[PDB]
Amino acid sequence: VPAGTKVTIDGSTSMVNINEALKAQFQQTFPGTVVQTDAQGTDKGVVNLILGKVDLSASSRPLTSQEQAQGLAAVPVASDTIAVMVGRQNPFAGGLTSAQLRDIFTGKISNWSEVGGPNNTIQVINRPSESGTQQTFAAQVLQGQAFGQGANFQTMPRDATTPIIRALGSNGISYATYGQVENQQTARIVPIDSLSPNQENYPLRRQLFYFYKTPPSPQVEAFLGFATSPQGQQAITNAFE
Template identity: 60%
Template sequence: MAKSSGPPPIVYILALLLIGGGGYWFLTHKNKQPESTVTNTQSTETQITTTTTFPSPTNVASGTVVRVDGSTSMVTINQNLKGGFEKQFPGTNVATSARGSSQGIQSLLAGSVDVAASSRPLTPQEQAQGLEAIPIASDKIAIVVGINNPFNGSLTSNQVKGIFQGQITNWSELGGANVTIRVINRPPVSGTHQTFKEMVLNGENFGNSSNITTLERDATTPMLRALGNDGIGYATYAQVQYQQTVRSLPIDNLLPSSTTYPLSRQLFYVYQNPPTQAVRDFLGYATSPQGQQAIFAN
């Protein structure tokens, strides 16, 4: 019988096992590195509004101008920082306006302002356009009535939700007089409106019943004047804390002055990346100990 030529069958078997094992390793490992890279990138993007910091400036060039527009809830903060910044750095000018968070952000994108004051976080679409936000201060949303409103009780969070969605329309449903509740709502361009919608209404819509009036312009003073003795509205606590014509209602038996008050939020300054030197200097001051002290000055 003739001898067979070539390697024995065991060699072919081993070769097939090696090829199969190599293919399996390639298929199971080829996507691991990109997945890790994507995860890291996403982690960085979700933190860009909270991790960016600016050094406190020691000198700011005379003639520096910073234009700020945005949330009506941040008028006092903007004015206090303006005063402190201009005093510490003579020859500088901080010009402030308050046309609402969304309008301020649109003005920032258009290049007509340098900083947008916002009472809401940035949307993913706004971040995608190169905007970044840093927290400036915490604030609280107060539920307010006229000083002579006869209702003196506390509201639960669910009752507040029901009032602003038109499900509770009479003060008698809350233990008060048999009088229709006039709800004074802010317009959708208001950052406080958007924050209230997320915080109190759980992202649901405001009601459209006949007792609810939505203001055309986002301004706190007209809203407070419209409350009368039967109205209810909402504002940032800093805006109404020292008002003599309105008062804040307790929510879940807690007044806004309480550290555990449930309707609290973060306030932001938004800038276009990369920031100019003027923006760096202003934000560095705003987040410095001196700036934080100025924010809460009476």
């Protein structure tokens, strides 16, 4: 890898830790290289990639046929699960079935008492449409149904988990990649169908990708060659804490 190689990344916030872990090992292994990272959400990365403003898009959902038709390709680098979370201050302590989870996010269930909590309105805190996590949750939970709307639904203006966690309060619910809530010191993870996101049969699972333009640029060839080598796999492993 020549000195002065620059790789630019945008896209998935779920993949921030993977981006940073690969950045760290890449520019330590190859002196004089630069990896620049941003994370405005999967769709924002795809837009920048199609317009040629970044070398790679991190994506937490699969490449679409329309995107592939513009000369894009994808490489999977990891997998994760999507946790459902409430605030540590929320007096609801239990779990949800998949049906209950869908009913909350469609608005059919709107009071915590319907799932065993107190008599309180549920505040649904949703990720914006550029979020690949939102797109995955819609596909795997809503299964063709639309998200609810109305006074008790809020879509955050930024695809970002920490502002969502702050907004949960004592009555809100949302979702995020498991690694960003795993230690439960900032939110409580809600088991789904009596399963927590570390379990193999936990239902909300997906691959994580880098998207790139074909034909690949030299800097993309260098970075993805590293990322898929054993050394790159070890760097990616460092993102899982």
